[PDB]
Design a protein around this ligand. Sequence first.
Ligand SMILES: *Cc1c(COP(=O)(O)O)cnc(C)c1O
Ligand SMILES: *Cc1c(COP(=O)(O)O)cnc(C)c1O
Lengths: 399, 399
Amino acid sequence: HVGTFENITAAPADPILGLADLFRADERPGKINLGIGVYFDETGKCPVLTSVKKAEQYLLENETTKSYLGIDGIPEFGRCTQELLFGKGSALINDKRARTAQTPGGTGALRVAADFLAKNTSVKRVWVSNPSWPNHKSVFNSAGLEVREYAYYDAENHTLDFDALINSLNEAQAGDVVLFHGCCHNPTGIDPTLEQWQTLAQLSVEKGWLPLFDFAYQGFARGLEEDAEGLRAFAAMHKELIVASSYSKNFGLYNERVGACTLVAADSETVDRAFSQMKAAIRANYSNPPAHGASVVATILSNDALRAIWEQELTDMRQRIQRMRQLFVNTLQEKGANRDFSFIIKQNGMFSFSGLTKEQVLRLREEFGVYAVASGRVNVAGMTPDNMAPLCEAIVAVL
Amino acid sequence: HVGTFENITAAPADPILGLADLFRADERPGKINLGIGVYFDETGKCPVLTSVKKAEQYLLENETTKSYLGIDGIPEFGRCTQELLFGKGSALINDKRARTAQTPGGTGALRVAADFLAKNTSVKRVWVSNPSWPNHKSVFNSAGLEVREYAYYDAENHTLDFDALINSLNEAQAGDVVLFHGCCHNPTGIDPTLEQWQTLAQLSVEKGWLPLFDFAYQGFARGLEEDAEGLRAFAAMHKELIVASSYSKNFGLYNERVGACTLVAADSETVDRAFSQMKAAIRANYSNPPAHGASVVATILSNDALRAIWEQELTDMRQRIQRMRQLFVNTLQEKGANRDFSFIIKQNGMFSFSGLTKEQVLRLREEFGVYAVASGRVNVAGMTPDNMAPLCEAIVAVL
Ligand SMILES: *Cc1c(COP(=O)(O)O)cnc(C)c1O
Ligand SMILES: *Cc1c(COP(=O)(O)O)cnc(C)c1O
């Protein structure tokens, strides 16, 4: 017989996760990794947080079973997630308008939302910022949804092009999904102001969009509560929305796959009805979610002494990044860059859109062992005081 | 505007996992849970294995990072899985014809295979046993694949209706997928003999089927190697096959979501090419897999001392279930059943396919607080010396 796999075409490598493979194989001792969005500390390692290690030790000594969780995961994980997103006293919570499923990462939450929408509603299109996280298109296309781009980044001025964004979104119809990053836009690090978020919320209800928030960096811009201001302005006005959140980065729990998909509807009866179909879509995907990482999150957020350790550890990560942004810009000028890079200071989170071309990024890898994403996205949290000078010498050499 | 979620139709509760909510709400003293397929010990609890606690302590002491795994997970986990499935000296391993992705549970492995097949092959139809695990049809339908049933169980003689199985698969075409349970058929506990496996292996190659094995109970029928004889007879003759395996039950790691999807192609170049598309399908779903559970498994299988502990714990579980089967048949007789239940002794695995009707199952629940699946599937591994007599009195009463 002819053979079912014989004619499969090879898939291109992932623009982000393929870099990990390339970086590992490189034998040069000076190689520098500015690709994948993980946090590195001052010594260039990706550590386990102290709050996490303490929680894991608690679990090891007190866990008595690994029996299946429910489809939607650990209840306390869901309650804690809704408080973080919407705030302790939220009317969305008092009115029982929100339901949360624990998922395997924020990616898993994005795919669950996508499958749920494609199979149970009339949604056909998802609007994504230009640029955005490259895996957004893959997730939504895989669920059967069309992806369209709205304008976002002004590459000449290194700023948000708000007029262009609104103009391009006038083409989105009622019942379309519009995706927003909650904070720390990936890859640009340029977020709307509160005033701009409020304008968008007002426009969103007027046009009948279904907001979907990808919230992977709560805490990395200004603070836990501050970073949720944009989402909360939407939640005050909308009958329906979806949040896909991740604890991969703000807890350093990347490989344990800890996220949540939160559904909001006009009332309790409607959200419970919708969530019954979200559960069915989960059952048909991975059945039920992995306990270890979510148990760690729920243990920390439920315990006042552990939470305070964690919040300080998150503030320390945010502030180290801020220090590297400033050090990066100053060192570029000292190494002979005659370009202005001060826009890097105005960007939030791990990632800076550096303005380097694909050919420059390729030279950095091949000639200098400096690994960045082909789009010019650099992970500022990969920078350390020890690698800053060789990094900047390399960038100046390709300008 | 109207609202995206208002036209949604509620989904029913899962026929297996929904039982937990019903059992938890029941206030009748003496209620008995024989529903979801988890192992219980003599005390009615679902314990963590000792080998697993030992491995989790090692991981707590030696993990230095939670940085993302590769898309296909822990390399050693893949190697250990292939040896368990195919045997240490397998030609499939030496010729590098097999690639394995770590997945979230066996369900995740089935879903990844479904998505991969739908988007990269001309497969349109999956054949599943009647009866089967109810989630099989949902997983394959989630990728848009038609699911057909083949005959399997002789409900009169409580045996494999092999002639009907053969005849009912007459219309399965070249390029159709045929799903086989590797051992401990769920729910019937009736498996092909080795001669029957060999007969199916030859028919499958002559007809050009793509075999997909669901392997969730390796080690619960007779033993680790013996339970793989059927798969290995297929692997000796086929150029292509897929194995979705689970460690939920044989390691007691249910809620950590530890499984594997193994692809086999005619040669190394072909399977690598196909595997690159499986990785793309994972990236667009949950991105990369959860580390904790698979690290436990890889640790135990890689250490001769821990592996010997685990193997004994698996033998212990299998033996307790066998003693409970005998006690179940004996006690039904002493409580006055006139129906002959001795066929239950011939069934493999955790379950007894009892022959009770939906009406008798509902009556057990409402009248006696005994919880089984509406198909008549009862979890023998949930029976104990302490609950056996009340259970049997309740069954005898609804007969
Ligand atoms: C990291 C990230 C994700 C994925 O988070 P995971 O928990 O690793 O799946 C999704 N969206 C954005 C914008 C991200 O930065
Ligand atoms: C348990 C089981 C599964 C799913 O296993 P998980 O690892 O819990 O996802 C799939 N198929 C069969 C036949 C099973 O018994």
